[PDB]
Amino acid sequence: SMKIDVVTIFPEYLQPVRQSLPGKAIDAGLVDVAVHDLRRWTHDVHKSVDDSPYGGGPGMVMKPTVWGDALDEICTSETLLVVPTPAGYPFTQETAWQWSTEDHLVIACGRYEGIDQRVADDAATRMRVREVSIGDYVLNGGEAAALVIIEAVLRLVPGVLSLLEGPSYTRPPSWRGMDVPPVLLSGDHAKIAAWRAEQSRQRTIERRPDLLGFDS
Amino acid sequence: SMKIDVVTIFPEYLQPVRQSDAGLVDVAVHDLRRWTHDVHKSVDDSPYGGGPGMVMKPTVWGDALDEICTSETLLVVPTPAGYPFTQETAWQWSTEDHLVIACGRYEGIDQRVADDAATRMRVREVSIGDYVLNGGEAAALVIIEAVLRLVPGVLSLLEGPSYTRPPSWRGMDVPPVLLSGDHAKIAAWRAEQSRQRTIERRPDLL
Ligand SMILES: Nc1ccc2nccnc2c1
Ligand SMILES: Nc1ccc2nccnc2c1
């Protein structure tokens, strides 16, 4: 039984949560996901969540006042506050396993430019805070990163049921003149294991040499 | 002018991205089950050579891509076994006329689909990261967003901390250098902040 709160200025964008793995998890009552519009915690008539950065630079920074009020209401001392950001620690499969046993995740989604640093500083006096990057590409905002984190974590939650995977095949055994590798049809568990290992080796060394401790 | 076609068994998943309005991209989402052959609308089957999970059927994907792709298409297949998707990749793809993104489950699509497609068109199998998702839909979302923000009209080292009003909040002041009006010094301070944060969070970048 896990609770996930997502805070965003684009709550309708978190709707893809409702299908696939996360939707089934919610429907089965293993997790509850609640999405909050950040502007709920604004008090000016224009619902302003951002302002220009001190020191200059392009873009805007999300205001600490609004985030502070939001997180005051949503978070407790047991909360794990997740802040997706291009400047975060890497989010890995190990991170996913670690967070899969948490009672309460709060995910704060900002734009790329980011949230005033003092929000995370202030929250860390009260709760555990993790700023993480899902990758070294650039998104407009944290919302898509939130969906990725949620999907990676939820599939590891109890109750929701190295080397690259090599190629996989299914019926029919010949298709457009391309045959499935005969060893896979042979029913020889040993030779199949050997073949799959060799395929995975070739693929990892070609596509992800870093996984085996090589350059690039 | 970019066209993106996405093929998925969860078409609802992708509808929220389609809302940017400028009309410079077209993003179309297609339900893979449109191309199934049987009344049960089967999209996957047991893997040859045994093992857990299911593999998506070549006959179904073959029909879908035949209808949707042309020789000009860049066929993107998100997969944990892919080449890394990077910002360099996003820049490259941002000038393409036609991307087709084939979303499959973790276990993947029969390899003959991509192998066959690669005899007629460019195919790119890519991973958005080394965590495991159940399906490629979230990865497609990440890819679409990273690419489209580089298409004009939609509008190293880590970035260090940023600050805005008010100057003092809950007992913490904005670093005074940022208010100094010494812009060379501010740049140096930010560069040192970046160095420190990169060392701490992403030493791989050095
Ligand atoms: N909040 C954000 C904004 C953009 C991002 N781009 C890549 C990875 N994480 C991100 C988080
Ligand atoms: N098609 C898929 C399925 C799962 C994934 N997990 C991580 C990265 N890419 C993925 C693509």
Side-chain angles (χ1 to χ4, degrees), chain A residues 84-86 110 112 133-135 137-139 141-142 145:
Chain A
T85 189
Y112 181 90
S133 167
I134 63 156
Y137 32 82
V138 175
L139 307 173

Side-chain angles (χ1 to χ4, degrees), chain A residues 93 148 151, chain B residues 77-82 102-109 126-137 139-140:
Chain A
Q93 191 56 23
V148 168
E151 178 136 359
Chain B
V77 186
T79 189
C103 302
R105 53 186 294 152
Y106 178 86
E107 294 80 359
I109 307 178
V126 298
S127 162
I128 60 157
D130 278 339
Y131 32 78
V132 174
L133 308 177
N134 233 50
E137 283 74 23

Side-chain angles (χ1 to χ4, degrees), chain B residues 64-76:
Chain B
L65 302 179
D66 280 359
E67 182 173 329
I68 294 177
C69 300
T70 68
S71 64
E72 295 314 285
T73 295
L74 183 73
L75 174 64
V76 179

Side-chain angles (χ1 to χ4, degrees), chain A residues 63-77 79-110 112-134:
Chain A
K63 306 181 65 52
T65 58
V66 179
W67 274 111
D69 289 343
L71 297 185
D72 277 358
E73 178 174 333
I74 296 174
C75 299
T76 76
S77 54
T79 293
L80 185 72
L81 177 68
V82 178
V83 186
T85 189
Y89 299 83
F91 176 79
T92 67
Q93 191 56 23
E94 294 85 326
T95 316
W97 278 113
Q98 286 154 13
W99 295 357
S100 74
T101 57
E102 293 286 341
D103 291 307
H104 188 207
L105 299 186
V106 169
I107 311 181
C109 308
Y112 181 90
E113 318 303 322
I115 305 162
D116 188 292
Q117 188 58 52
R118 287 172 293 176
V119 176
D121 286 5
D122 176 62
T125 71
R126 225 147 72 246
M127 71 197 72
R128 298 159 297 144
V129 180
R130 308 283 182 262
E131 307 179 61
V132 297
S133 167
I134 63 156

Side-chain angles (χ1 to χ4, degrees), chain A residues 171, chain B residues 9 31-40 42-45 54 57 59-61 63:
Chain A
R171 299 182 292 177
Chain B
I9 66 180
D31 189 336
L32 179 66
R33 296 192 195 274
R34 179 164 157 206
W35 291 276
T36 54
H37 314 291
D38 64 320
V39 61
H40 301 73
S42 307
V43 301
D44 50 31
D45 192 13
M54 304 283 273
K57 296 170 75 65
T59 55
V60 175
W61 274 105
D63 278 3

